[PDB]
């Protein structure tokens, strides 16, 4: 009877419930409102979420992430060939052409299809909701990117069925974000909505039209390899060069564990820089037992990422051109994805749209789950949200 909305994200997942017309985004057992889409295998246990991301640098070969980049794809696809450079875990092709993720679990070699890894993330999100509700949860609405094909959607639905969920519907991420803001019920007449979704690994821009409660995806664009991890890498590359200038040319990049530890701290400092003018990147015994410390101003972060931030406007211009419409015709700009919290990105979008304030009242990394939760309640017969 109870239905949840799940954003099964590339890097982070989020679960919400819409009861009595209001939406609660549910915190996990660490108090986090989003959960890493990570699954790790050790000598003793299967870790999911925060626990899996937290030991990634200690167990790189057996820590799986990015299964969303493989779900519903053939191993031979050029996307898989190109993406696999980024993965410390092994991925091979089965006789059926499906990707097989290979890990060691309890001293044994184990293989998993992408939908099996995603089913474990979905199972964790289901359990996060169940702990909060104190009752079992069976029904769910799961979101997918607008460009996902039938194979990708079907495999995501299968991941839900494996997790023990009755998938009421698979819906588009940009549409879920628009539903979260009630833009389907907002007044009347045609409304042109731009969804600017910049997450941990991907960037998606979608131009929607809403006429009479019906959402149509007019045009989409973006970059499948532009997200928060690329901004973290700018801080990593800077710190690697700064360590060289401080420690007689010593190169941290020669040690992959030193890079991973630095990357964890670079991402934390990046988050701090979204609400403070300065942040510290500190790693004790980073490389050769040498302690590392550096202060980064928001201005230096903005400078390192200057081109990447400005280039987010290129897919915005593309969707407007494809939809044959002017930027002045966009009624609402919705900010989605954790990276939209970066002040410079918010300023660039506002300036592009001639001072129009973007819709950001909902925590951007929760807006998709929030909309999916609303849709789950509607599909369960609850008309209180409307
Ligand atoms: N406060 C913050 N400032 C800057 N970046 C932030 C942030 N809070 C979260 N992020 C970034 O958001 C990304 C994850 O975004 P999210 O929307 O949850 O992930 P996803 N799987 O949908 O792509 C990470 O790169 C994270 O560092
Ligand atoms: C209702 O019970 C169900 C039981 C099993 C599945 N699917 C399943 O096992 N699929 C799969 C895909 C790829 N690799 C391994 C497994 C779905 C529903
Ligand atoms: C310095 O400015 C920028 C540089 C690169 C990007 N994106 C990017 O590398 N895209 C990509 C997509 C798919 N495969 C590989 C790469 C964005 C801004
Ligand atoms: Cl419900
Ligand atoms: Cl409760």
PDB file of N, CA and C and ligand atoms in Angstrom, residues 96 98-99 111-116 155 157-165, ligand 2:
ATOM      1  N   UNK A  96      26.391 -13.515 -23.744  1.00  0.00           N
ATOM      2  CA  UNK A  96      25.186 -12.801 -24.168  1.00  0.00           C
ATOM      3  C   UNK A  96      25.456 -11.309 -24.497  1.00  0.00           C
ATOM      4  N   UNK A  98      26.313  -9.027 -22.358  1.00  0.00           N
ATOM      5  CA  UNK A  98      26.020  -8.171 -21.217  1.00  0.00           C
ATOM      6  C   UNK A  98      27.274  -7.954 -20.384  1.00  0.00           C
ATOM      7  N   UNK A  99      27.451  -6.741 -19.849  1.00  0.00           N
ATOM      8  CA  UNK A  99      28.601  -6.498 -18.966  1.00  0.00           C
ATOM      9  C   UNK A  99      28.497  -7.306 -17.680  1.00  0.00           C
ATOM     10  N   UNK A 111      30.697 -12.550 -10.120  1.00  0.00           N
ATOM     11  CA  UNK A 111      30.347 -11.659 -11.231  1.00  0.00           C
ATOM     12  C   UNK A 111      28.899 -11.175 -11.089  1.00  0.00           C
ATOM     13  N   UNK A 112      28.640  -9.928 -11.471  1.00  0.00           N
ATOM     14  CA  UNK A 112      27.307  -9.359 -11.376  1.00  0.00           C
ATOM     15  C   UNK A 112      26.949  -8.573 -12.628  1.00  0.00           C
ATOM     16  N   UNK A 113      25.694  -8.653 -13.074  1.00  0.00           N
ATOM     17  CA  UNK A 113      25.216  -7.791 -14.148  1.00  0.00           C
ATOM     18  C   UNK A 113      24.979  -6.384 -13.518  1.00  0.00           C
ATOM     19  N   UNK A 114      24.988  -5.321 -14.350  1.00  0.00           N
ATOM     20  CA  UNK A 114      24.767  -3.965 -13.821  1.00  0.00           C
ATOM     21  C   UNK A 114      23.466  -3.819 -13.021  1.00  0.00           C
ATOM     22  N   UNK A 115      22.374  -4.464 -13.475  1.00  0.00           N
ATOM     23  CA  UNK A 115      21.084  -4.409 -12.788  1.00  0.00           C
ATOM     24  C   UNK A 115      21.116  -5.115 -11.420  1.00  0.00           C
ATOM     25  N   UNK A 116      22.054  -6.062 -11.211  1.00  0.00           N
ATOM     26  CA  UNK A 116      22.214  -6.692  -9.905  1.00  0.00           C
ATOM     27  C   UNK A 116      22.875  -5.729  -8.940  1.00  0.00           C
ATOM     28  N   UNK A 155      16.052  -2.644 -17.878  1.00  0.00           N
ATOM     29  CA  UNK A 155      17.044  -3.148 -16.948  1.00  0.00           C
ATOM     30  C   UNK A 155      16.921  -2.429 -15.567  1.00  0.00           C
ATOM     31  N   UNK A 157      14.027  -1.264 -14.351  1.00  0.00           N
ATOM     32  CA  UNK A 157      12.786  -1.859 -13.811  1.00  0.00           C
ATOM     33  C   UNK A 157      13.126  -3.216 -13.199  1.00  0.00           C
ATOM     34  N   UNK A 158      13.956  -4.022 -13.885  1.00  0.00           N
ATOM     35  CA  UNK A 158      14.434  -5.338 -13.428  1.00  0.00           C
ATOM     36  C   UNK A 158      15.247  -5.197 -12.129  1.00  0.00           C
ATOM     37  N   UNK A 159      16.099  -4.170 -12.028  1.00  0.00           N
ATOM     38  CA  UNK A 159      16.844  -3.908 -10.798  1.00  0.00           C
ATOM     39  C   UNK A 159      15.858  -3.708  -9.596  1.00  0.00           C
ATOM     40  N   UNK A 160      14.747  -3.022  -9.863  1.00  0.00           N
ATOM     41  CA  UNK A 160      13.710  -2.803  -8.873  1.00  0.00           C
ATOM     42  C   UNK A 160      13.049  -4.100  -8.474  1.00  0.00           C
ATOM     43  N   UNK A 161      12.683  -4.932  -9.456  1.00  0.00           N
ATOM     44  CA  UNK A 161      12.051  -6.233  -9.187  1.00  0.00           C
ATOM     45  C   UNK A 161      12.993  -7.141  -8.382  1.00  0.00           C
ATOM     46  N   UNK A 162      14.302  -7.124  -8.694  1.00  0.00           N
ATOM     47  CA  UNK A 162      15.286  -7.915  -7.949  1.00  0.00           C
ATOM     48  C   UNK A 162      15.357  -7.429  -6.496  1.00  0.00           C
ATOM     49  N   UNK A 163      15.257  -6.100  -6.287  1.00  0.00           N
ATOM     50  CA  UNK A 163      15.286  -5.506  -4.950  1.00  0.00           C
ATOM     51  C   UNK A 163      14.040  -5.770  -4.115  1.00  0.00           C
ATOM     52  N   UNK A 164      13.021  -6.404  -4.694  1.00  0.00           N
ATOM     53  CA  UNK A 164      11.767  -6.705  -4.013  1.00  0.00           C
ATOM     54  C   UNK A 164      10.705  -5.632  -4.155  1.00  0.00           C
ATOM     55  N   UNK A 165      10.899  -4.698  -5.087  1.00  0.00           N
ATOM     56  CA  UNK A 165       9.964  -3.603  -5.302  1.00  0.00           C
ATOM     57  C   UNK A 165       9.057  -3.907  -6.482  1.00  0.00           C
TER      58      UNK A 165
HETATM   59  C1  LIG B   2       9.795 -11.297  -9.154  1.00  0.00           C
HETATM   60  O1  LIG B   2      11.052 -11.935  -8.924  1.00  0.00           O
HETATM   61  C2  LIG B   2      12.120 -11.626  -9.732  1.00  0.00           C
HETATM   62  C3  LIG B   2      13.198 -12.498  -9.743  1.00  0.00           C
HETATM   63  C4  LIG B   2      14.287 -12.253 -10.562  1.00  0.00           C
HETATM   64  C5  LIG B   2      14.323 -11.122 -11.368  1.00  0.00           C
HETATM   65  N1  LIG B   2      15.371 -10.833 -12.264  1.00  0.00           N
HETATM   66  C6  LIG B   2      16.658 -11.312 -12.295  1.00  0.00           C
HETATM   67  O2  LIG B   2      17.115 -12.134 -11.509  1.00  0.00           O
HETATM   68  N2  LIG B   2      17.377 -10.722 -13.303  1.00  0.00           N
HETATM   69  C7  LIG B   2      18.747 -10.761 -13.533  1.00  0.00           C
HETATM   70  C8  LIG B   2      19.294  -9.983 -14.547  1.00  0.00           C
HETATM   71  C9  LIG B   2      20.643 -10.048 -14.773  1.00  0.00           C
HETATM   72  N3  LIG B   2      21.495 -10.789 -14.058  1.00  0.00           N
HETATM   73  C10 LIG B   2      20.949 -11.549 -13.106  1.00  0.00           C
HETATM   74  C11 LIG B   2      19.617 -11.554 -12.793  1.00  0.00           C
HETATM   75  C12 LIG B   2      13.230 -10.267 -11.373  1.00  0.00           C
HETATM   76  C13 LIG B   2      12.136 -10.515 -10.563  1.00  0.00           C
END
